[PDB]
Amino acid sequence: HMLIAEALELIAEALFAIALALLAIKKDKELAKKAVELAEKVYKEAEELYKKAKKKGDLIAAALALIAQALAAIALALAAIALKDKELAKKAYKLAEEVYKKAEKLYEEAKKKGDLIAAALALIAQALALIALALAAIALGDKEKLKEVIEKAKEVYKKAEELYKEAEKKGDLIAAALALIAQALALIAIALAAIALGDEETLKEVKEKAKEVYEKAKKVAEEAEKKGDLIAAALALIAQALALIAIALAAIALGDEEELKKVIEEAKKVYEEAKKIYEEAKKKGDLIAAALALIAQALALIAIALAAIALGDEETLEEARKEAEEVKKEAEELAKEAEQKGNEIAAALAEIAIALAEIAIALVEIAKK
């Protein structure tokens, strides 16, 4: 359980570098270089953790190590846009390609052994790596690289759909929710690539397919709540928020103001539902499920922030910023309670919610002036 908690801490550190790169978009070159140095350090540390997890046979810890590697490449690509550095954008592209190739081998090994949870996490690392490739290709202006992102992301979407159906037939609702997370992240990679290419039809297909993921995640959350699995229910709410982020990105490029207003309404329902799961998880003592509920709250506020910025809704933007600070304070209290009871996994997951809430705050500051 120590290798899993170590990888989750590296995930939170990678998200901290993303917020640093997002804040540099203030237009500060030295701030963008500080986010670069943190991203390369997290990438190297997660590489050593991946080798240790593979040496011990912990496929779950090895997959989480690759997820931190993909988030480190995303921060490197975001710094490339702020610095206009094509040489550094090429390095982020190369590092993201190595994560995609490593996660592909791990997904095959986990599928043959029956570990559906580890296989779903490997697909999440592939989808996150494709987001880094899309951002790096945008900084380079490579139309050939943008088309490769769309083709690879379609393979991740198809692999996650087969894994979701297999997990649903076996009753593994945790792996089924993780498979829907990889689908929503893969659609985000396509949306970013289709925007730079100006593909209206592909953006229209992302919107309808993300709605299908949103409806499937609502069914998993209701089934997990009936069985008493609050961990799977919180993961299903995370997939709901990530699917709404993909719909917002597509509605932004297509100029669908009515769809953006529906995203805010739906994301508010996910945020309120995640608050009920948090109260139920804390009452029964499930600190891992409670931390995942705060993660779903932060992602739901990110979807609200993106839609309100494109709509110019300052009242809703101010509301999401206030709720983001409330999530950050609650996660700090949960981290103290988790370490007081020796639950290092929940303590690391609470740190991920803090970094996610800081990303939403950075998004609000980006639109201010």
Numbering used by the authors: -1 to 23, 25 to 368
Recite the paper's sentences.
Here we describe efficient routes starting from validated parallel and antiparallel peptide assemblies to design two families of α-helical barrel proteins with central channels that bind small molecules. Computational designs are seeded by the sequences and structures of defined de novo oligomeric barrel-forming peptides, and adjacent helices are connected by loop building. For targets with antiparallel helices, short loops are sufficient. However, targets with parallel helices require longer connectors; namely, an outer layer of helix–turn–helix–turn–helix motifs that are packed onto the barrels.
We chose four protein sequences with <85% sequence identity, high pLDDT and low Rosetta energies for gene synthesis and expression in E. coli. The other protein, named sc-CC-7-LI because of its a = Leu and d = Ile core, was helical and fully resistant to heat denaturation as judged by circular dichroism spectroscopy, was monomeric according to AUC and bound dye, consistent with an accessible channel. We solved a 2.5-Å resolution X-ray structure by molecular replacement using the AlphaFold2 model for sc-CC-7-LI. For the parallel targets, the experimental structures show minor fraying at the C termini of the inner helices compared with the seeds and models, which appears to improve the packing of the external three-helix bundles. However, the symmetry of the central parallel helices is maintained. The backbone RMSD values for the repeating helix–turn–helix–turn–helix motifs are ≤0.5 Å, which is expected given the low sequence variation in the loops and the hydrophobic cores of these buttressing helices. Finally, to test the robustness of the design to mutation, we substituted all 49 a (Leu) and d (Ile) sites of the central α-helical barrel for alternative design rules for parallel heptameric α-helical barrels (that is, a = Ile and = Val). This protein (sc-CC-7-IV) was highly expressed and was also folded, as shown by circular dichroism spectroscopy and SEC-SAXS, hyperstable, monomeric and bound the reporter dye. The success rate for making single-chain constructs from these initial five parallel designs was three soluble proteins (60%) and one new α-helical barrel crystal structure (20%).
